[PDB]
Each structure stands twice: as structure tokens, then as C-alpha cells.
């Protein structure tokens, strides 16, 4: 085919699968442009992987992510991780590894969750209480 790399980012339950093909700087979320990702107030979380390195890195590549599961915020963090990892995997596979290590350096120096998925998951609920640690009120 062409120069294509496929990756994924994850938060609590949300998972975003990114397809990065060779083309123009086309960046879509479930077939929709990234300039209108909701919620609006967290739009700069997905703007961070763009403005941190500079949009020139995305001239030759187009990125389309498909995020499902989780919630609104967990989906935003899954998307920004899928974008950062897709860009890294493309540099690692079709560009020199010096640039891939450079990108990984800026990304890691700014936010670990850009490349490393956060491992926190919900603790199971235990009987005798309404939560993981919380217990029913005791009376004497």
C-alpha cells in the first residue's frame, strides 16, 4: 500500500485507534475535523500534541482516529495519546530514529500521558458498603 502506521491511545475505558497514512495534513476525529472536538474547554488537550512539536511534522501525514468507549474526558485523553503515538510510530518507521527520539524527548518532558497510558483503573466495590472503601454507616 503506502506508508501507513496504526496505533491506539487509552484512558480509563476510552480507546482511540489512529490510522496514519501518507498524504496531506488531514486530521480527523471519527470523520470530523479536529477544530471542533468537544468539549470545547478541553480542546487544548488535543491541541498540545500539535503545537508542542509544530504542525510542520504533520504535512506529509494524515491522521484519522476512531475513539470509542469511556467518557468525554477519557475520550479526549485517548485521542491525544493516539495522535502522539501515531506520529511517533510513523517517525520510527519511515523517518530516521533521531527525529523519533527528539519527538519522544519533547513529549516525555511535557506530559507522560502523551506516550504512556495512565494505568489507573476503578477499584472494585466490596460488599458491606456503597463503594470500594466506603462502608455503610454503623449504629450502636
Amino acid at each position: 500500500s503506502t506508508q501507513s502506521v496504526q496505533t491506539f491511545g487509552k484512558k480509563k475505558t476510552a480507546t482511540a485507534v489512529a490510522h496514519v497514512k501518507a498524504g496531506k495534513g488531514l486530521i480527523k476525529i471519527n470523520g470530523s475535523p479536529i477544530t471542533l472536538v468537544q468539549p470545547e474547554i478541553l480542546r487544548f488537550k488535543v491541541y498540545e500534541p500539535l503545537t508542542l512539536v509544530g504542525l510542520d511534522k504533520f504535512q506529509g501525514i494524515d491522521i484519522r482516529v476512531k475513539v470509542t468507549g469511556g467518557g468525554h474526558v477519557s475520550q479526549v485523553y485517548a485521542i491525544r495519546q493516539a495522535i502522539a503515538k501515531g506520529l511517533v510510530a510513523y517517525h520510527q518507521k519511515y523517518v530516521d530514529e533521531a527525529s523519533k527520539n527528539e519527538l519522544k524527548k519533547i513529549f516525555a518532558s511535557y506530559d507522560k500521558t502523551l506516550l504512556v497510558a495512565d494505568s489507573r483503573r476503578m477499584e472494585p466495590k466490596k460488599f458491606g458498603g456503597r463503594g470500594a472503601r466506603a462502608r455503610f454507616q454503623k449504629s450502636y
Binding site: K24, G25, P33, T35, Y47, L55, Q59
Partner: peptide, 24 residues
């Protein structure tokens, strides 16, 4: 100003120079 296939607004493209709280 860097022209992409997916157009990126001017103010957020200005964030490449500097990281600012709420870009402000």
C-alpha cells in the same frame, strides 16, 4: 502560518511560539 489540510485556527497556531494559560 502553517497550512494544513485540516485548517488550524490562527490563535492556536500562535501557541507554537509560547505555552500560555488558556492561551492568554
Amino acid at each position: 502560518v502553517v497550512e494544513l489540510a485540516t485548517t488550524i485556527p490562527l490563535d492556536v497556531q500562535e501557541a507554537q511560539r509560547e505555552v500560555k494559560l488558556f492561551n492568554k
